[PDB]
Amino acid sequence: GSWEIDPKDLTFLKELGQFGVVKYGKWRGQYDVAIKMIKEGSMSEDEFIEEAKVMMNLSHEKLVQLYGVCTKQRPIFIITEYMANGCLLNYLREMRHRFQTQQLLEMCKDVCEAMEYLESKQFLHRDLAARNCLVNDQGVVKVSDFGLSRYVLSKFPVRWSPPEVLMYSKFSSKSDIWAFGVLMWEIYSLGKMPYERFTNSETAEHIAQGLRLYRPHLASEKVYTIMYSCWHEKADERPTFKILLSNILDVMDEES
Ligand SMILES: C=CC(=O)N[C@H]1CCN(c2ccc(C(N)=O)c(Oc3ccc(Oc4ccccc4)cc3)n2)C1
């Protein structure tokens, strides 16, 4: 299989972190990889295997590169590039990095470039959040687990969902745009949980009454305008990822 990796070619070396376990390893004793082993029973494997073919064709510098899958096993393995600094959410929470706001904005831009590419290929992420982004050895943020929620068999991403998703299950590019605004908020808040005082239940009720996430102190007024634009009540009034990207570039230039 063009999408098919022989598990014999994989050496397991260290552990890295519901879906199952990830391990760091080498392919042909030579190439760094991460190996997510899918917990048996947790996933719709045949559907996933068909989708993997499409995912295999997705290629972008800011998207985590899939190398293949091990099918014909139990559990299946998903093989990607190794991202040394692990998940974005944890990275943000390590206060030792002492990020400059220019570094936070670059994280936003990395993700927005990935999401712009997905949007140009009509591919919906469907669970975009800092927990599902990864960070490489150079501090580059990349989008991970794209589309994966479709195959997983009170744990729903309420805090990253627009009102039409919460009320009617209307997913669209514009529900990814909402989630992206919430990811900018996570970044500027250095990894706080969105609506940090509320339960999921309260968050839904508050979103329906028009509540929005407050401006994190590290966000400039112009950066807040951007994430705020992602949360219009009317989906059609939210920007595209292409517009978000140009806005993020403008701010980078103005706040250089
Ligand atoms: C913040 C929460 C947390 O602890 N998350 C932990 C759980 C994932 N963990 C990691 C850590 C490092 C890596 C790494 N590449 O080096 C990693 O690789 C993955 C991630 C997803 C994946 O499956 C895919 C499905 C669809 C599209 C693309 C990939 C396959 C490999 N996963 C951290």
Which CATH code fits 1-82? 3.30.200.20
The method of structure determination was X-ray
Residue 143, token pair as written in the block: 């989008």
What are the CA-CA distances from residue 237 to residues 19, 204, 211, 229 (Å)? 35, 20, 17, 8
11 lines ligand 1 (CB under 6 A): no
Domain ranges of the chain: 1-82, 83-256
Closest alpha carbon to 49 in 76, 22, 30: 76
Q: Which residues of 203-236 are buried (b: 16+ CB within 10 A; e: fewer)?
A: bbeebeeeebbebbeebeeebbebbbbbbbeebe
Q: How far is the CA of 14 from the centre of ligand 1 (A)?
A: 14
Strands (E), 58-214: 66-70, 77-80, 133-135, 141-143
What is the C-alpha to C-alpha distance for residues 157 and 174, in angstroms, rounded to an integer? 15
Identify residue 191 by its one-letter amino acid code: G
Residue 216, token pair as written in the block: 């994190």
What is the C-alpha to C-alpha distance for residues 215 and 241, in angstroms, rounded to an integer? 21
Pocket test for ligand 1, best of 42, 51, 64, 118 (most atoms within 8 A of CB): 64
**Distance from the Cα of residue 192 to its chain's centroid:** 16
* Helix, strand, coil tally for the chain in percent (to 5): 45, 15, 40
CB 133 within 8 A of CB 175: no
What is the C-alpha to C-alpha distance for residues 188 and 190, in angstroms, rounded to an integer? 5
Query: Could you please report the per-residue DSSP string of 207-242?
Result: HHTT--PPPPTTS-HHHHHHHHHTT-SSGGGSPPHH
CB 147 within 8 A of CB 57: no
What is the C-alpha to C-alpha distance for residues 115 and 119, in angstroms, rounded to an integer? 6
64 lines ligand 1 (CB under 6 A): yes
What resolution in angstroms does the PDB record give? 2.0
Would you name the residues annotated as active-site residues?
127
Q: How far is the CA of 36 from the centre of ligand 1 (A)?
A: 7
Q: Is 126 exposed, middle or buried (0-12, 13-18, 19+ CB in 10 A)?
A: middle
Q: What is the DSSP letter of 18?
A: -
Residues in the chain, how many?
Answer: 256
36 lines ligand 1 (CB under 6 A): yes
Binding residue per annotation — 39?
Answer: no
34 lines ligand 1 (CB under 6 A): yes
What is the C-alpha to C-alpha distance for residues 24 and 32, in angstroms, rounded to an integer? 7
End-to-end Cα distance, the chain:
47
Return the CATH fold of 83-256.
Transferase(Phosphotransferase); domain 1 (1.10.510)
CB 27 within 8 A of CB 10: yes
Binding residue per annotation — 188?
Answer: no
H or E element, residue 188:
helix 173-188
What are the CA-CA distances from residue 151 to residues 4, 117, 235, 240 (Å)? 19, 22, 26, 26
Q: What is the DSSP letter of 43?
A: B
CA-nearest residue for atom 26, ligand 1, is 145
Q: What is the DSSP letter of 63?
A: B
**Distance from the Cα of residue 122 to its chain's centroid:** 16
Q: State the CB neighbour count (10 A cutoff) for residue 93.
A: 14
Q: Is 256 exposed, middle or buried (0-12, 13-18, 19+ CB in 10 A)?
A: exposed
Q: Which residues of 5-29 are buried (b: 16+ CB within 10 A; e: fewer)?
A: beeebbeeeeebeebbebbbbebee
Q: How many CA atoms lie within 13 A of 69 on its CB side?
A: 20
